[PDB]
Design a protein around this ligand. Structure first.
Ligand SMILES: *[C@@H]1O[C@H](CO)[C@@H](O)[C@H](O)[C@H]1NC(C)=O
Length: 96
């Protein structure tokens, strides 16, 4: 239980994995940052979870940055954009 790690995503993008690994992958449409077991192998007492992000260019083909971040757990999807407020609820209504 004491074990705890993090995925550190740095804009302009640069990724730091849970394990110690860094790379400079870039993309243009939404990707699966993390989620449940895609093959469904060795899962006990699993709970749904999925975090996905979307990237796009900013003026040069070779650079991409993060625009929106989405999560989805327990029949509840949370979406965040660059608007300083929530916009998180299932319907997508803006929230404080
Ligand atoms: C990992 O467990 C919780 C989960 O976020 C966190 O608050 C805590 O600070 C972390 N503990 C350690 C030892 O890294």
């Amino acid at each position: 239980p004491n074990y705890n790690s993090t995925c550190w995503l740095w804009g302009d993008p640069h990724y730091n994995s849970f394990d110690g690994w860094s790379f400079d992958f870039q993309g243009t449409c939404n990707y699966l940052l993390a989620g449940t077991l895609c093959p469904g192998v060795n899962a006990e007492g699993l709970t749904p979870f999925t975090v996905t992000t979307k990237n796009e260019n900013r003026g040069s083909p070779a650079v991409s940055y993060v625009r929106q971040v989405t999560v989805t757990t327990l029949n509840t999807n949370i979406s965040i954009h660059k608007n300083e407020i929530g916009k998180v609820r299932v319907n997508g209504v803006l929230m404080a």
